[PDB]
Symmetry: C3
Subunit: 307 residues, 3 copies
Amino acid sequence: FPLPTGYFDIPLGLAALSLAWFHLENLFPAARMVSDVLGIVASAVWILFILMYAYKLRYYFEEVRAEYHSPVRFSFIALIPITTMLVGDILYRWNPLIAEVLIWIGTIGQLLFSTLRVSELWQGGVFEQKSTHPSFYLPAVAANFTSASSLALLGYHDLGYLFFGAGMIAWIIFEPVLLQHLRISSLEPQFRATMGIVLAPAFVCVSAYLSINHGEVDTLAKILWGYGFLQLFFLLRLFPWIVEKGLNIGLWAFSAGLASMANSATAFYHGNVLQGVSIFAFVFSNVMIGLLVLMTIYKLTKGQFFL
Amino acid sequence: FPLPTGYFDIPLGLAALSLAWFHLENLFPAARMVSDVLGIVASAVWILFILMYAYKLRYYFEEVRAEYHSPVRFSFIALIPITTMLVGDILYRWNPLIAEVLIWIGTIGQLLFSTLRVSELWQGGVFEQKSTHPSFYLPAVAANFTSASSLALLGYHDLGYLFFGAGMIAWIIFEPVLLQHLRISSLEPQFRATMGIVLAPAFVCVSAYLSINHGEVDTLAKILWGYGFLQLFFLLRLFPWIVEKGLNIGLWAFSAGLASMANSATAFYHGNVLQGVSIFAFVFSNVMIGLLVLMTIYKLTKGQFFL
Amino acid sequence: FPLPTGYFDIPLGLAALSLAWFHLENLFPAARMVSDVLGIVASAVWILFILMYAYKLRYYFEEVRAEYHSPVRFSFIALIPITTMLVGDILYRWNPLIAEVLIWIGTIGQLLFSTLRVSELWQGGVFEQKSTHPSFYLPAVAANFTSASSLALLGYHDLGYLFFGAGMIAWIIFEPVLLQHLRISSLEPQFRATMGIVLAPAFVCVSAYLSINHGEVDTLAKILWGYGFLQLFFLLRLFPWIVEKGLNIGLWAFSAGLASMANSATAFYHGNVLQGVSIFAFVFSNVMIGLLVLMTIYKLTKGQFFL
Ligand SMILES: CCCCCCCCO[C@@H]1O[C@H](CO)[C@@H](O)[C@H](O)[C@H]1O
Ligand SMILES: CCCCCCCCO[C@@H]1O[C@H](CO)[C@@H](O)[C@H](O)[C@H]1O
Ligand SMILES: CCCCCCCCO[C@@H]1O[C@H](CO)[C@@H](O)[C@H](O)[C@H]1O
Ligand SMILES: CCCCCCCCO[C@@H]1O[C@H](CO)[C@@H](O)[C@H](O)[C@H]1O
Ligand SMILES: CCCCCCCCO[C@@H]1O[C@H](CO)[C@@H](O)[C@H](O)[C@H]1O
Ligand SMILES: CCCCCCCCO[C@@H]1O[C@H](CO)[C@@H](O)[C@H](O)[C@H]1O
Ligand SMILES: CCCCCCCCO[C@@H]1O[C@H](CO)[C@@H](O)[C@H](O)[C@H]1O
Ligand SMILES: CCCCCCCCO[C@@H]1O[C@H](CO)[C@@H](O)[C@H](O)[C@H]1O
Ligand SMILES: CCCCCCCCO[C@@H]1O[C@H](CO)[C@@H](O)[C@H](O)[C@H]1O
Ligand SMILES: CCCCCCCCO[C@@H]1O[C@H](CO)[C@@H](O)[C@H](O)[C@H]1O
Ligand SMILES: CCCCCCCCO[C@@H]1O[C@H](CO)[C@@H](O)[C@H](O)[C@H]1O
Ligand SMILES: CCCCCCCCO[C@@H]1O[C@H](CO)[C@@H](O)[C@H](O)[C@H]1O
């Protein structure tokens, strides 16, 4: 099938970045146009990819079945409800009714997905030590944080905290075994771009947290940022190894973390906490997503995007 | 010996459920009679099982020695001081002096037990990867949370927080390796009922926390509930696999988590946080413990309770 | 080379203990003289060891290269910037300018060190399961906590919280796999003194936390102390096994945890939280570091200190 499921990282990153710029509109009015443009592009890409995945389900179902039952590849399916919710979050600025439908569909969908598949892993004998990949964060962590912030947008703050807690504790519970595995077992080049997902947890976490707690930059938020930056520095040092075999579209795996660096930066700035660091983070993350967009346009022009 | 040590889960669940109903007496006065009945039954069962275990120690000591030195079976011994403290907590409503004696005996006992046995594991060569079982939560986590809430009942809030922290961090430190093990290694049917202990940590944690913090349903409490419900949903989906080889008395392993869902629900309700979810949780957990009681009466009638 | 890198634990422990006594000066004025004496001795030892390590770098570089590339021995190098910062913290009482230079040198140095080496481990194939040692806490955890408290001393509280969060989450993320490894694999006698580093995380954590949060002994601080004491009790029970093959200078590995027990005790006492426990902790930790000093003087007199 021409669209790899991981390509949903593209509308993910663009949508999350739209939301970051939305949050600067009262500081700088021109930010709203930037936000609206990113949000429209993200939503358009999302519509296309959803329609493609619907085609995959109807006409390439055995491919979906295999990816679903894989103890590694199943995780990327979580990008579908994650991006559904982020597009709902964008659309809320124009039509809260349609936004709320998408947010609930994505929330119910992700929770059903993890409840069916993530739990099934605990039966043993399918997941192996070599299945311990960064992509596991998507259904386990990122999906819950996205529900948390989306439900908060709709006014469901206490429900949002339930999802937030599920994501935060799931993160802390998985990461220890992931990092140990990475230390011992060299992740093969074909999977290395997924190291970008390692950037996500702390930044997604703090972004979701600030979405639910009325943007109060408190001790927890600062603690999360600190570990987030540690991981950034580690991944920056590792970047040449990450791309040993060349630049590829899989690098959009970094975009959840990058866009969430941008979003959380707007809240730190608004709160007058570490404004200088905030400006750095916001500019850095925009530049890197900008480079992702330029490499993507390049690939599309050369006919090297779709399978 | 006719009584398996794990049968202490029975008075555990009944006692904790008594405490949950106790907490509804000011909302609904009739809750006190329900609480008192459960508490008396729990205490009676506890007396019987303690006397049986005393008989085991005196006359079947090599069985106790073997269970103690086992890197898997040692954990169930922690049920003894846990239930001692919970019975003390019940009895506090009638006789705070006797209650305080039981609470200190259970606290000193559990701390000595873990200090002797849990630490010894760090010498290596005895505990194996296959020893990584949910039962490890009992001495490591549940016992500290029970001390925390019991000491808070007696007015020792800051000491309670020390025990609370020991339990909470011990939980977060063990669970990562447990879930990885479950993913890789299929837990054999003879141990699967112990999957019920996986329900316990977040719910016991929040119940203990709310016992020490004057029932303030805050961000931490909501975060814990969220992960607790995630685990519930996972265990509900796994339940047919859990009971693949049939229903058994080991299912009382679920009762710490179920009773703590009930207890924490009363505090969320009192705090006007997620009242609807609270009512669901309280009813659900009571119904499931009710089913445990019905299956137990059935087994006793058929002569299939004691070994 | 005559000085093992681990000997930097000596000025570490003495320096941290100086800081603990400094914090009692307003309660008991004579504490300042004790603090100043420990601080001068710590600083003198530090100067000597730094000059020795400079000699090692210039004239024994291949030894440094090998220790740096080792997935186990690299960690002890982090003691160098850690102690640089602690000596800066001492010197702040006399010369804030020189203190600030040392604190930034140690902060930049430790962050560069971990960014280069800790991240490199994630490439796989070098670190092995048997590399999972307590010493990993030094670059990963202790160095960040030391930056946190040192930057707070200089007035950089929000930056301090970033370092604090990096250390705290790094701790929680490593400890699960460490304790599992210790359970399964018996740590060989030649490394067992490093079990003392297991005492460090919770106590260093709470000490750093209280340094940044204006000494407010809150729920987090109490939670940390509780797990800290759990680990102390475990290590006390394990102590005969730790020293199975005899007392050795490696036991200074305990001093980060002991000195941080002392420091945090002063803050709990100041806050009127668990004063009795605080007095116990402060006396205990001073006595144990005192014994370390006596065994060290003994070794120096017998010519058994330097390699
Ligand atoms: C977007 C998510 C895609 C879902 C793919 C579902 C794969 C399910 O797959 C199948 O479901 C059947 C029952 O319905 C079983 O009988 C099949 O054996 C099982 O493979
Ligand atoms: C991502 C949006 C929602 C996910 C829908 C997934 C539905 C999966 O379908 C299910 O797969 C199971 C296996 O785990 C089968 O056993 C079930 O019979 C079937 O319900
Ligand atoms: C896994 C890492 C979890 C760390 C959680 C940090 C504990 C929250 O820290 C709390 O922040 C509050 C608001 O700023 C303060 O009022 C409290 O004093 C402080 O304890
Ligand atoms: C996420 C962070 C993005 C925020 C972008 C802020 C860029 C504004 O820049 C700031 O403008 C201020 C007045 O507006 C000046 O006082 C500051 O010195 C200047 O740094
Ligand atoms: C309720 C808990 C039951 C405790 C069982 C204790 C098992 C101890 O067992 C024994 O202790 C002796 C020392 O006293 C040793 O010499 C024995 O070799 C050791 O097996
Ligand atoms: C559960 C209530 C309290 C528990 C009491 C346990 C006492 C265990 O007994 C001990 O077992 C040790 C091994 O770890 C032996 O080495 C000791 O000599 C003995 O003190
Ligand atoms: C392992 C998961 C630990 C998460 C700890 C959550 C940090 C506590 O969260 C804190 O709650 C306080 C009371 O509601 C608020 O005042 C603070 O703003 C908030 O930071
Ligand atoms: C742990 C939760 C158990 C609490 C049980 C509450 C059942 C009461 O039910 C509630 O009664 C209220 C007045 O009392 C009505 O206003 C509410 O609509 C109704 O839901
Ligand atoms: C206090 C810390 C000591 C640092 C020791 C550094 C070890 C680096 O070592 C070397 O660096 C070179 C590049 O500079 C490489 O070419 C070498 O192959 C590599 O071994
Ligand atoms: C402890 C105080 C600061 C630490 C300085 C460490 C400098 C290490 O040096 C580096 O080692 C690398 C390998 O990881 C080499 O690849 C690099 O070329 C070199 O920069
Ligand atoms: C890994 C363990 C992390 C536990 C973090 C504890 C959460 C912080 O606990 C918070 O402390 C605050 C200050 O005392 C209180 O105001 C809040 O009510 C409480 O939730
Ligand atoms: C880290 C803890 C070190 C603090 C040492 C405190 C020793 C003082 O001791 C205390 O003195 C008080 C008046 O000063 C008396 O009221 C107390 O009863 C006594 O315990």
